[PDB]
């Protein structure tokens, strides 16, 4: 069938993505990294996390423009410039300055598509969580004890040459869940805006919640919780 | 249903378009000309060549294992490392193989099944000197004057590794080859033979499906 081999082409290539991103759940130090990314096929959502000299933990939430497999390339691209950063740093940071240069990357007519991430690297022995966003993509939303907010922050996606980004420090609590969302909300642009803050507190906090939704999505949708408690 | 993957395949088809460098482009007297055909839109053959300080120049033909999607991803990864590394070396320069090693790096590790299949070339226009580097098993280069083989990565190991004719015109190819005879050891030795009494030009890569494996070549003529 014609059909039949354009789907085994798309589907080795969302087989190839499954590689690519962490296990879950995974879980260091008493924080517990979980993820679900729900693509047609080839997905421009992709969630990384990564050890770091195990005194920093760093991870992210990107979706780039649009959907599908022109979008699905950039992803590829982003796993790539993180993992080689840390080889960069040789045997022998802000975040701010990695979404720079994922941003510099992406400039030089790299496929003229920009993708909105929410960077965040925590340090383990301080409790530091310090987090950048790029994008205008739904905040994320910390838990505490029954209730759940925003950690607001302004901006470029990486589509302009001079960065400007601003990165903002943050310390946690004993027991905390901090969610990272895509642009899929369904799961009055700004009164749904208000949902997830309140719909995240409401409902399990843990990803067995987000699990239990698996007729396409209009725009790929993923999430990234972290929680220690 | 099936349309609509047809356009999303399309859209992956118009951004490697563009990823590739014009043909014919000639500097120098060098005339840089490519032709991939790719069999379910999305391709693992890819070729790129660019211009670096005017004195020398670097090309290479990549075919990542199998094709479509899933080894399309593999060359947008080697477009970026190529361009990067130029604007990472600066003044110093400093080798094809420490090239091919730099894109090894980057592939094993952060990746599961796609290696990639190479041959590599920096030219020296100054001195007609072209160093050449291959890495994969792929059909070697044919030369052209009578033509013939030039003597010559998954793995952690890095194992990877002249002068030129006043009128020449050396060919890459890919794995996938179409005689249209009835004869791999006999098909690895008409190459070289259909590509001399053949046009050496692109010209004749021009005239002339599908699957099993995508096709591509890259053809380097001087005179
Ligand atoms: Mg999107």
Redesign the pocket.
């Known amino acids: 069938a014609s059909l039949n081999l354009l789907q085994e082409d798309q589907n080795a290539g969302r087989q190839v993505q499954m590689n690519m991103l962490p296990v879950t759940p995974w879980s260091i130090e008493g924080l517990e990294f979980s993820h679900r990314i729900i693509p047609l096929y080839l997905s421009?959502?992709f969630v990384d996390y990564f050890r770091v000299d195990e005194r920093r933990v760093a991870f992210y939430l990107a979706?780039?423009?649009?959907?599908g497999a022109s979008?699905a390339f950039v992803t590829v691209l982003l796993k790539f410039m993180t993992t080689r950063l840390l080889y960069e740093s040789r045997r022998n940071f802000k975040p701010s300055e990695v979404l720079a240069h994922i941003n510099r990357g992406l400039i030089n007519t790299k496929l003229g598509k920009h993708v909105?991430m929410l960077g965040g690297v925590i340090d383990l022995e301080k409790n530091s969580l310090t987090y950048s966003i790029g994008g205008h993509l739904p905040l994320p939303v910390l838990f505490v004890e029954g209730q759940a907010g925003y950690l607001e922050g302004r901006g470029p996606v990486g589509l302009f040459d001079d960065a400007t980004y601003d990165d903002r420090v943050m310390e946690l609590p004993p027991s905390f869940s901090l969610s990272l969302f895509?642009?899929?909300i369904l799961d009055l642009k700004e009164k749904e805006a208000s949902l997830p803050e309140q719909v995240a507190a409401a409902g399990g906090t843990l990803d067995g919640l987000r699990q239990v939704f698996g007729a396409e999505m209009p725009?790929?949708i993923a999430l990234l919780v972290l929680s220690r408690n």
Do not use: I
Request: proline content about 0%; overall charge negative.
């Open positions: 421009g959502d979706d780039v423009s649009g959907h979008s909105t895509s642009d899929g725009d790929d």
